[PDB]
Symmetry: C5
Subunit: 103 residues, 5 copies
Amino acid sequence: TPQNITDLCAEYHNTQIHTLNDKIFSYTESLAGKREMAIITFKNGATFQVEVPGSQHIDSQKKAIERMKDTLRIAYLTEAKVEKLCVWNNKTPHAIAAISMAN
Amino acid sequence: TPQNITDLCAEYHNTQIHTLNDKIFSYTESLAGKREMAIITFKNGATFQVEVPGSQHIDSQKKAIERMKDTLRIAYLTEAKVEKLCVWNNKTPHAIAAISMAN
Amino acid sequence: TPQNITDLCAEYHNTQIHTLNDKIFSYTESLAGKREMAIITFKNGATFQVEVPGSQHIDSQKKAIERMKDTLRIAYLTEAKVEKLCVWNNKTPHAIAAISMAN
Amino acid sequence: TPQNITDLCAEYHNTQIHTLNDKIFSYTESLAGKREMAIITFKNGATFQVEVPGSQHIDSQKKAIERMKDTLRIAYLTEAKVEKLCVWNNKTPHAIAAISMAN
Amino acid sequence: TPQNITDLCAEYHNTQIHTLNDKIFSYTESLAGKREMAIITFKNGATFQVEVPGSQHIDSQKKAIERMKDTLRIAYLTEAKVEKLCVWNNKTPHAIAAISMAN
């Protein structure tokens, strides 16, 4: 299996790594229908989403999506530095696939 | 694919943004039958609910309602500053659709 | 819907408000069969339970009972001030229906 | 309903109370097959488990087993003083039935 | 039942203990399809995974895998010292079977 987020990210099409090395600036979450999603920003203006669960997701991703929103909330509240995000870049805002935290 | 809470809120009928820029003053939650809900207030008196789950909600909103109560509770306990709430204004108290946190 | 815990509590028979304005002094929880419950106390000695789920609970209350035990545990560990409890007084210990927290 | 952990403990066969009045010294958790369990120790060497869910457990206990493991982990991480444990003493390590925490 | 992680680990083939006595240096998690996993590293370079749930896992392990990722996340964020990991060393990175925290 992959040993780091960059190698993991590269197993997929339409992805890229963003390097942030910064805490999350804002955390937004919605329960409105068809927009049950989270959005984060950084102070540089960079904006990312956790997508609404949909037909593009296989069943094993469903729990992991819920976990990622849990992770972003507590990272935001603890001011944890985000190192990198692996994102799909065929969505706007780019859609989070993976996160690494260090330092 | 909204990039922020204001653009997300605009997608729905009967909504408005409240700008708080303040921590939650009180957090209330109930397990009483038919009132399985949360209520928050701010020191300015503004009061908001997370509605009891009902037929006005589609299935995908159910998990998101539970997450929102989780979010309000930890926001309260950590004294996190709430930036904005998107709410439905055809309920009293106004009903939360989305939350943003930022300092 | 209710604006606050007092109005909510008044919707139910056999309830009363206890005003504590204090942190939880002790937190007890059990996984023993037929006693899957939590008990809290306050410094003055007053004792309260989250009841074992039973036939008196409608289905929607089950998730809320689990949430309430989560809330009590974190409130205890963070030394959060409990403002009020709405309780059923036809049980001993009195059974928690709702909680408000405020400083 | 029992008022405290000691009275709760007394309702079961093969139980005893341990009075620790100490934080948890170590926390161990396993996802290995047939050993999906947690083990804790105290400085005095006393060791306790949350048992693997099994046919000795009724359905209502399943959620409470999961909650107990959640409680032990966060108690460990926050250095929360554990007052008493009610345990089944017909297992080794003794198997946790209930926990109380007080300052 | 085992009294500690070393004895637990020794019940399984293809395992070893690693003694770290250090906090986690980095935490990575993924919701990408077929790579719903977590990876942690230590400052010495040691790298470990929580494997993607698969056919090698029995049903009882599923909840425990989710719990373990919860544990690693919070251990990372709180800088909790990890004492030992029990791992399967027939996978690269080595796959976590159990964790102990002390000190």
